[PDB]
Amino acid sequence: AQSVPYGVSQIKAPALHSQGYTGSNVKVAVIDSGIDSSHPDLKVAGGASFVPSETNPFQDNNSHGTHVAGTVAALDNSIGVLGVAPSASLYAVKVLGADGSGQYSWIINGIEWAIANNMDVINMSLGGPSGSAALKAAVDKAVASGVVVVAAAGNEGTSGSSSTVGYPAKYPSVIAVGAVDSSNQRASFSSVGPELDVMAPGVSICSTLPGNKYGAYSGTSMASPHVAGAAALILSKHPNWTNTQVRSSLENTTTYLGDSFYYGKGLINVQAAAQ
């Protein structure tokens, strides 16, 4: 009784899955509130915690990190859900606490950890209204090192004529991901701005929750892991590809939805991006 969430089908991942491309050996770091490693539908390979109060990265006191991890790599088996890249080595980088909040030094420390342990893909379903020199330096350093960095655009909606995309998604080096529903329409809470790159399903997204549960969440945080998992599926087919050609492939083969200020280049199509 394994259910494939609409989001995985929408981005066309199951087409790569049937060819033998499931993201094997690609290392994906889920910089978030930790991942519940005791979940029978998740296989966490490693990680580290930078939350001074929550030293176990494999204990998710919020539920956010486990949900995001499931969209990325919920195992292909007989139970629960199926991720975008079922065979990726999942890394729990806990930078957010039980309350869902985290300080920048902790997040930046986690980004540094991912660079030094050679994460092929960094996923940041988090953000804030302000950036620092150090947050820009960490994300640019990861990209200069060959890491594909993906982050949620934010859940700020519209604000007149300006950008509501948060950081680190706002930085030119990070792929900013917005949210669409099942019918390909922008979700009202999705952040907008010239920084938006791609869209992925982020409305009523079913994924793994701590304590052998499954539940649906809505937000750009749920959109981001579809792209991070799509980058892993593309790297499993094309391991020689640099982070730049992966991002270039993902942005240039999207399905066009309205204006770029609201939809970026459009909905990702991992089947077309993987060639």
Cα–Cα distances in angstroms (integers) from residue 154 to residues 8, 194, 245, in the given order: 21, 13, 25
With beta carbons less than 8 A apart as the criterion, state whether 152 and 125 touch: yes
With beta carbons less than 8 A apart as the criterion, state whether 260 and 194 touch: yes
Task: Name the phi and psi angles at 46, rounded to 5.
Answer: 180, -160
Site string for Ca ion, 40-59 (x = CB under 5 A): -x------------------
Candidates 21-29, 54-62, 194-202, 257-265; binding stretch for Ca ion (CB under 5 A): 194-202
Of the pair 26, 176, the CB lying nearest Ca ion is at: 176
Asked if 219 touches Ca ion (CB under 5 A), the answer is no
Q: Which residues are catalytic?
A: 32, 64, 221
Cα(215)–Cα(207) distance, integer angstroms = 6
> From the CB of 253, what's the least distance to Ca ion, in Å?
18
Restricted to residues 156-175, the positions that interact with Ca ion (CB under 5 A) are 174
> From the CB of 176, what's the least distance to Ca ion, in Å?
4
Q: Which of 7, 23, 57, 80 binds Ca ion (CB under 5 A)?
A: 80
Lookup result for tokens 């065979």: 87
With beta carbons less than 8 A apart as the criterion, state whether 16 and 233 touch: yes
> From the CB of 177, what's the least distance to Ca ion, in Å?
9
Site string for Ca ion, 1-40 (x = CB under 5 A): -x--------------------------------------
At 217 the three-state DSSP class reads: strand
Question: What dihedral do alpha carbons 64, 140, 274, 269 form, nearest 10°?
Answer: 50
Nearest to 31, CA basis, from 75, 1, 72, 3: 72
For residue 258, give both structure tokens.
């309205």
Site string for Ca ion, 99-138 (x = CB under 5 A): ----------------------------------------
Number of residues that bind Ca ion (CB under 5 A): 8
- All residues at 6 or more sequence positions from 163 whose CB lies less than 8 Å from its CB, including other chains: 170, 191, 192, 193, 194, 195
Site string for Ca ion, 56-75 (x = CB under 5 A): -------------------x
> From the CB of 183, what's the least distance to Ca ion, in Å?
26
Q: Which of 3, 19, 77, 188 binds Ca ion (CB under 5 A)?
A: 77
Which residues would be at the binding site for Ca ion (CB under 5 A)? Answer: 2, 41, 75, 77, 80, 174, 176, 195
